[PDB]
Amino acid sequence: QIPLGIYEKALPAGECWLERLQLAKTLGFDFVEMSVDETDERLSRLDWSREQRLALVNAIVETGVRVPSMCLSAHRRFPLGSEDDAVRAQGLEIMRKAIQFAQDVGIRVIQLAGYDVYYQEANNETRRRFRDGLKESVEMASRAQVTLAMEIMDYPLMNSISKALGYAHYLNNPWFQLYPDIGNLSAWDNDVQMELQAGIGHIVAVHVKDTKPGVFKNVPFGEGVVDFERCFETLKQSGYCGPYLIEMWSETAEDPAAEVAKARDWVKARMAKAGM
């Protein structure tokens, strides 16, 4: 088996989760990755009532479609490296609330964004604050027993598996792992296939998307520089047995389901070629 998931933001935008999960099932997916992004609407999920949390658990159990991971891109707006101590405190409360939320609804993995700061310029001060924020986050994670997994990013601080492995060695904690995005990994000057193999005992999930140098969003599958077949071959041959998540933003398309179905078959053909 190869568990295959779809990004929340590839599907229609309604906060109706049972409908979302039914659609994913219909489209042939095993799971949906939730996004808790910079928007107040998705951020407000962290303030959901017990009944709202439990309704999500209900929909998951009823449909069989899991929500095993949360993409926590809210830290782009409230980064852990902020020299604004108010903004940083806000990033840390979001982290705490995301961990409690994951405990409540049974999310397995919180995918962290490797930004020390995004909208502000980086320096030694922001990197040190990010490092300390990350250590604090992993401590909360260790208490809760919730996996935090650093994504390989559209940003120089975390633009390879190697740099994430640096953080993993520093932290030396079972609850801090790796969540490579093969698109982001391919959009710099990395030896991608060597990076995938190097990270193996730390890789808990894989984001599947295409990219170009300096273009990390909305590059159509096949129009970028990602060698999908090679990546899948490397991961399979190195013993990877975890999930793959198709990352796309077709929520805005005329027919989101149709865009998703085409990307699904496209991605699946390449996995099949790679022996999976």
Which of 146, 185, 226, 231 touches a second copy (CB under 8 A)? 146
| Interface region with a second copy, contact rule CB under 8 A, candidates 97-105, 124-132, 210-218, 257-265 | 97-105
Contacts 24+ apart (CB under 8 A), 127-134: 127/81, 127/157, 128/81, 129/80, 129/81, 129/82, 129/83, 129/88, 130/79, 130/80, 130/81, 130/157, 131/167, 131/170, 133/80, 133/81, 133/88, 133/91, 133/92, 133/95, 134/80, 134/167, 134/171, 134/176
Residue type, 30: D
The interface with a second copy within residues 17-56 (CB under 8 A) comprises 50, 53-54
CB 145 within 8 A of CB 94: no
Which of 120, 162, 173, 197 touches a second copy (CB under 8 A)? 173
Site string for Zn ion, 103-132 (x = CB under 5 A): ------------------------------
Determine which helix (DSSP H) or strand (DSSP E) holds 71, and give its type and residue range.
strand 69-72
Q: DSSP letter at 106?
A: T
247 binds, among a second copy, Zn ion, none (CB under 5 to 8 A by kind): Zn ion
154 near Zn ion, rule: CB under 5 A: no
CB 129 within 8 A of CB 80: yes
Query: Shortest distance, CB of residue 189 to a second copy, whole angstroms?
Result: 27
Which of 175, 221, 228, 232 touches a second copy (CB under 8 A)? 175
Q: How many residues bind Zn ion (CB under 5 A)?
A: 3
Which of 38, 48, 96, 106 touches a second copy (CB under 8 A)? 106
Residues that bind a second copy (CB under 8 A): 1, 3, 50, 53-54, 57-58, 61-62, 66, 68-69, 103-106, 108-109, 138-139, 142-147, 172-175, 177-178, 200-205, 239-243
